[PDB]
Design a protein around this nucleic acid. Structure first.
Ligand SMILES: [Mg+2]
Ligand SMILES: [Mg+2]
Ligand SMILES: [Mg+2]
Ligand SMILES: [Mg+2]
Ligand SMILES: [Mg+2]
Ligand SMILES: [Mg+2]
Ligand SMILES: [Mg+2]
Ligand SMILES: [Mg+2]
Ligand SMILES: [Mg+2]
Ligand SMILES: [Mg+2]
Ligand SMILES: [Mg+2]
Ligand SMILES: [Mg+2]
Ligand SMILES: [Mg+2]
Ligand SMILES: [Mg+2]
Ligand SMILES: [Mg+2]
Ligand SMILES: [Mg+2]
Ligand SMILES: [Mg+2]
Ligand SMILES: [Mg+2]
Ligand SMILES: [Mg+2]
Ligand SMILES: [Mg+2]
Ligand SMILES: [Mg+2]
Ligand SMILES: [Mg+2]
Ligand SMILES: [Mg+2]
Ligand SMILES: [Mg+2]
Ligand SMILES: [Mg+2]
Ligand SMILES: [Mg+2]
Ligand SMILES: [Mg+2]
Ligand SMILES: [Mg+2]
Ligand SMILES: [Mg+2]
Ligand SMILES: [Mg+2]
Ligand SMILES: [Mg+2]
Ligand SMILES: [Mg+2]
Ligand SMILES: [Mg+2]
Ligand SMILES: [Mg+2]
Ligand SMILES: [Zn+2]
Lengths: 55, 74, 96, 106
RNA sequence: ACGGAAGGGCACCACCAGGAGUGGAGCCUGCGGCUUAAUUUGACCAACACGGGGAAACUCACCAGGUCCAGACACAAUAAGGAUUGACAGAUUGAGAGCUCUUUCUUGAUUUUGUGGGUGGUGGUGCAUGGCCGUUCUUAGUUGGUGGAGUGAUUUGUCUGCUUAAUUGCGAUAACGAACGAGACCUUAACCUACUAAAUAGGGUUGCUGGCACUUGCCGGUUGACUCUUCUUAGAGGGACUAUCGGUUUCAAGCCGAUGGAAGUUUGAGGCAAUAACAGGUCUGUGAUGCCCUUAGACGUUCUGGGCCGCACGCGCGCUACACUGACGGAGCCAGCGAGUACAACCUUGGCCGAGAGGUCUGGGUAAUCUUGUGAAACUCCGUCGUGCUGGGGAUAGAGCAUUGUAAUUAUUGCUCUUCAACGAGGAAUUCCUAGUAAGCGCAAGUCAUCAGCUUGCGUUGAUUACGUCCCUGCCCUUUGUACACACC
């Protein structure tokens, strides 16, 4: 694990550049308004976030 | 939903590069002048500072405190 | 891990001074925040402390919140050989 | 001596409404009992913030989708006002939820 | 439960009247199959443009390979005459990896190797499970308390009728009163010359200015001044409840028709949405998780490269078309939902240059302020073409210029030229739909660095045909028959 070879590849961008911040998942991520959280984690925490079903 | 085959290897072996347990490298490093002055052997490191002995390979004396800094011909 | 001892003792000292630490999950990153060490062996040192029972870890949203126990304070003081009277700033009761 | 007219300008923000409305009511009541010149609590289009998500975490099932949202209300106000009474007004009568910002219009 | 049994009601995931189509064509995209080292995987009405799954590195799950240990802690064991680590240069390696080796150095009790023990796992098990949503089931249906009937399984209440979209009511009643579901309720859309206000929205007057007609009229500009709030905003509220009337109705529940109105289908569209259940899907979202498996040449993690996008074939969403209601030129010039740069680098106006994609320099904008009045398309008007697989159609094909990217080859994407194929309204079948509706037309947002044919939402141009029936496909409840109860598979 060379210090310049281990984890060498850049991650400035792309799918893996960002994490769920709740589960660390890559798939099903939401980036709108900087949520940076996935589909379903949003699905339940949104009520505490301030979101509510209206229409 | 899958059963995995055994990882058969067409590779003989790669073992940990064991460090060599050197027995009293300091006698190799120093040389006593009959209960008095003592000399050092084969160089001293100018890039690292006094007391750090250097490496003998060939046509170049080598560092290893700050390893990449000093490997010069002499 | 194989911590250069100075790094370990400065980690422990910072832990004592603050009384607690977070050390965000992100692995493989060079520089841990506000301590000038690598997050990796910070995390591993705190794991070693918890396996000793000196530290209680609450893990929420990938952050590893750490808390010191009194016996952890005692052992840390012994390791950092400070006078027995000193306390982490957490023990300095902030009364508002 | 702080007699210079400040043209102080306030801007509110609230996820909800009634707290914002009563905060604005309190601000205007304080200004009027202090004899100040005001441009009224102007109403700005409440920006709706919408996110549509798939309900199922796995994609199985009939396609069913939901739309969470907030509705943010800003409703800035502004006074042609001196400092100390007005700055004291700014620092009083804040309830949680409603966020207040002040710009001096210097 | 079922019935090619009966009865009374319902539904464009049924039909009727039709509209638009799909199925024929090329393209895209997802399955299967085949192939491959790998084409990682899970769904088979409720799978198939789904897992937001628009995979070039990652995502990663597969494959060829190289690293490292992110093996805490306990014990033993070595061991300070060194547990060990790291290492230039070369061999070797894809590598500028001390991976391994040659040597030598450097490093010092954090270690090392054995025993436990624990972590890690997009490893397995959705037929162990939680949570989650889907479906049964967009229908109207559920349930208990005393009370009656039965020895009991249960039943009545939950019903003969009429009525409603509704177990919705009028009622009748061994039933009585109650609870959930429906409704009620909330969001949105509409109406407010009534209120509150406004240089982050508008309008009038009036300055100062531009052009024309010259009569003082128009059209303009202008962070000038004053004033106003109809338009734009958003708070308080107001407004409709079937109102009024005429029919019809055991005259009750209501249903129909006209007027008033903005609105007279529950005003339109929605959101939540009962009991019971499925061996429906999901361990591949989770540091939700039991068990089992693995835990050092690893199923951990990382690095390079390959694939997930391959091709004898079939199938599902969609796209462009088959041209004259057209294609191509000009000219006209109208929106509405959004979003937008911070610990970084977005929206980008304008002035440059270039044919173009584009780059360039200054700007504004953290946001009704700027992009923006997103000057969008279809469409509108004037021309060219002229029934020709033709100027329809634009796939498949060479070359060039750029752009994002560490990296575009297996063509990311754009632009320029050239090539112009298949295609003649599409068999059996089958989908969706009753008013701002279908259909056409784009735009904004998700994904995003770059990428859409997808998708959510938005607005624009805006209809033909019903306003009914159980004939096909189902659904409600009642009656009935059954050898069914894993329930007509
Ligand atoms: Mg038909
Ligand atoms: Mg079509
Ligand atoms: Mg076809
Ligand atoms: Mg495959
Ligand atoms: Mg169904
Ligand atoms: Mg891509
Ligand atoms: Mg790859
Ligand atoms: Mg890889
Ligand atoms: Mg390998
Ligand atoms: Mg995981
Ligand atoms: Mg199941
Ligand atoms: Mg009883
Ligand atoms: Mg019953
Ligand atoms: Mg309701
Ligand atoms: Mg008004
Ligand atoms: Mg009447
Ligand atoms: Mg409705
Ligand atoms: Mg239900
Ligand atoms: Mg598990
Ligand atoms: Mg793995
Ligand atoms: Mg694929
Ligand atoms: Mg076919
Ligand atoms: Mg579909
Ligand atoms: Mg043409
Ligand atoms: Mg034209
Ligand atoms: Mg507009
Ligand atoms: Mg246009
Ligand atoms: Mg042609
Ligand atoms: Mg078209
Ligand atoms: Mg998609
Ligand atoms: Mg009908
Ligand atoms: Mg059908
Ligand atoms: Mg039986
Ligand atoms: Mg049979
Ligand atoms: Zn040196």
């Amino acid at each position: 694990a060379h210090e310049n070879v281990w984890y060498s590849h850049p991650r400035k961008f792309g799918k893996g550049s960002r994490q769920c911040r709740i589960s660390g998942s890559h798939s099903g991520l939401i980036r709108k308004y900087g949520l940076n959280i996935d589909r379903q984690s949003f699905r339940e925490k949104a009520n505490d976030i301030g979101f509510y079903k209206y229409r | 939903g899958k059963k995995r085959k055994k990882k058969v290897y067409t590779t003989p072996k790669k073992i940990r590069h064991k460090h060599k347990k050197v027995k009293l490298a300091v006698l190799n490093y120093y040389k006593v002048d009959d209960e008095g002055k003592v000399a050092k052997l084969r160089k001293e490191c100018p890039n690292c500072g006094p007391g750090i002995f250097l490496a003998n390979h060939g046509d170049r004396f080598y560092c290893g405190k700050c390893h990449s800094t000093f490997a010069t011909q002499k | 891990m194989l911590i250069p001892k100075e790094d370990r003792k400065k980690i422990y000292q910072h832990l004592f001074q603050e009384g607690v630490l977070v050390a965000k999950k992100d692995f493989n990153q060079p520089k841990h925040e506000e301590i000038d060490t690598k997050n990796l062996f910070v995390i591993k040192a705190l794991q070693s402390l918890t396996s000793k029972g000196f530290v209680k870890t609450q893990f929420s949203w990938q952050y590893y919140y750490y808390t010191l126990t009194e016996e952890g304070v005692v052992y840390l003081r012994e390791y950092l050989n400070l006078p027995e009277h000193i306390f982490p700033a957490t023990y300095l009761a902030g009364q508002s | 001596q702080e007699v210079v007219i400040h043209k102080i300008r306030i801007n509110l923000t609230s996820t909800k409404v009634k707290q914002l409305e009563n905060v604005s009511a309190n601000i205007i009541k304080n200004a009027e009992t202090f004899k100040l010149v005001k441009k009224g609590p102007v109403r700005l289009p409440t920006k709706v913030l919408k996110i549509s998500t798939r309900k199922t975490p796995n994609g199985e099932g009939s396609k069913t989708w939901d739309t969470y949202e907030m509705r943010i209300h800003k409703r800035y106000i502004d006074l042609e006002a001196p400092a100390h009474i007005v700055k004291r007004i700014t620092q009083i009568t804040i309830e949680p939820g409603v966020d207040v910002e002040v710009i001096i219009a210097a």
